[PDB]
Amino acid sequence: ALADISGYLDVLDSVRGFSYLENAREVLRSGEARCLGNPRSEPEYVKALYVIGASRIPVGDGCSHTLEELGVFDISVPGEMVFPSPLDFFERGKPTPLVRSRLQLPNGVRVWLKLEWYNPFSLSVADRPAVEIISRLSRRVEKGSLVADATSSNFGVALSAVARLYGYRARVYLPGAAEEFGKLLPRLLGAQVIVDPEAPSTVHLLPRVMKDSKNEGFVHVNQFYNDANFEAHMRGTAREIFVQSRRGGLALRGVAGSLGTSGHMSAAAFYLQSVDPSIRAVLVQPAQGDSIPGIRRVETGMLWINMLDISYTLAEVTLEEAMEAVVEVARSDGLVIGPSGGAAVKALAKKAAEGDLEPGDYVVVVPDTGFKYLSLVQNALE
Numbered sequence: 287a288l289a290d291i292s293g294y295l296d297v298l299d300s301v302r303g304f305s306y307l308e309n310a311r312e313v314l315r316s317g318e319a320r321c322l323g324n325p326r327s328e329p330e331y332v333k334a335l336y337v338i339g340a341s342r343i344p345v346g347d348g349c350s351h352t353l354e355e356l357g358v359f360d361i362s363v364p365g366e367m368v369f370p371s372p373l374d375f376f377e378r379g380k381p382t383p384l385v386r387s388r389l390q391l392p393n394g395v396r397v398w399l400k401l402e403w404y405n406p407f408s409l410s411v412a413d414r415p416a417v418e419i420i421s422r423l424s425r426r427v428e429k430g431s432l433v434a435d436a437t438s439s440n441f442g443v444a445l446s447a448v449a450r451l452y453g454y455r456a457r458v459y460l461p462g463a464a465e466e467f468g469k470l471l472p473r474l475l476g477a478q479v480i481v482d483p484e485a486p487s488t489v490h491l492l493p494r495v496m497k498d499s500k501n502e503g504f505v506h507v508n509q510f511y512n513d514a515n516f517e518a519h520m521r522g523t524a525r526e527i528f529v530q531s532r533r534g535g536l537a538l539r540g541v542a543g544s545l546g547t548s549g550h551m552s553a554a555a556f557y558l559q560s561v562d563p564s565i566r567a568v569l570v571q572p573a574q575g576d577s578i579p580g581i582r583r584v585e586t587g588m589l590w591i592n593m594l595d596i597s598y599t600l601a602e603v604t605l606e607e608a609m610e611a612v613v614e615v616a617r618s619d620g621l622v623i624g625p626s627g628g629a630a631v632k633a634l635a636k637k638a639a640e641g642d643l644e645p646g647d648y649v650v651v652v653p654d655t656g657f658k659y660l661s662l663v664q665n666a667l668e
């Protein structure tokens with residue numbers, strides 16, 4: 287029998303650790319889930335169903351239910367794109383678009399771009415962990431409280447918009463090299479902004495954010511370490527790639543993407559590899575010395591990509607190459623993607639050129655829109 291999962295969402299605040307992900311993997315592998323006689327007594331199984339995108343739980347004795355029955359494949363978007371409020375727009379206005387590029391890659395690699403700027407608050411993939419993180423906290427943190435984090439730009443914008451929509455104040459910390467939209471748009475959205483010209487990277491800033499958190503008592507939502515980030519992408523980004531691949535008729539052979547906190551690409555690789563373990567994940571390594579906004583090198587400390595049972599391949603990409611790929615996609619598709627999106631197209635093209643990849647459909651997650659990076663666009667034009 288089926289029950290509405292929204293009833294059982296306290297397992298989100300009681301289950302800890304990654305061991306529940308075994309259940310998520312097996313349900314996705316087998317395409318079905320066993321009924322729970324006492325759902326309240328299996329909180330790991332319930333969390334696993336939420337995390338893969340079920341809206342209903344299987345309840346009863348000996349029965350089982352398919353992904354489709356559990357609502358993994360439910361259509362959420364009203365055909366007419368009308369929404370009673372901004373958060374309902376964020377929630378129901380999904381999947382984000384998956385668009386075949388006209389770009390031709392060597393060796394039968396067909397390229398599809400998943401456009402994460404179609405998120406309403408930061409015009410970036412960072413809306414999704416902001417919403418899930420503030421939502422989970424809205425259960426236990428009193429309204430009016432301050433929330434804060436370190437960001438490269440995007441997550442701090444999404445944080446400021448989302449915290450305000452739920453009744454919280456926000457503070458964002460940024461390094462001096464961050465884009466101007468990152469330092470300015472949070473103030474527009476009513477958040478306090480702290481810029482460190484000394485900080486060379488966003489993780490550099492984490493000790494200061496932690497220290498100020500002890501002194502002032504604000505909630506440090508810590509997108510680097512908060513599992514709600516990874517879980518937002520499992521039930522959003524990754525489940526969409528799966529559902530979009532199936533209903534789209536793609537022969538999905540891999541996904542490509544870039545790593546900041548590593549939340550969205552871990553989710554993508556973990557989720558799809560549960561369904562089919564030969565699916566590649568090609569991941570961008572910014573070249574040592576180079577700064578590509580929003581992203582960073584693996585060895586510098588990433589939670590999910592490291593701890594989860596995920597296969598991936600790295601590719602080194604310089605900022606110059608990322609920008610040449612922004613240029614090619616624009617001229618080829620008329621879409622203007624951000625530097626980290628060009629970096630992932632470039633990483634996929636490298637692997638294609640080397641003969642490493644099966645022919646088929648590859649999805650590239652494009653984190654944001656190039657319109658936000660005019661100085662780098664001007665440099666690339668040269």
Ligand SMILES: Cc1ncc(COP(=O)(O)O)c(CN[C@@H](COP(=O)(O)O)C(=O)O)c1O
Pocket residue numbers: 410411412436437438439440441442488489544545546547548549550551579580581582624626627653654
């Ligand atoms: C523009 C851009 N491109 C890629 C990413 C990577 O997503 P992840 O968190 O792996 O999921 C982001 C994410 N931006 C964060 C993190 O900045 P860091 O370099 O310290 O991870 C942000 O603060 O906005 C992004 O913005």
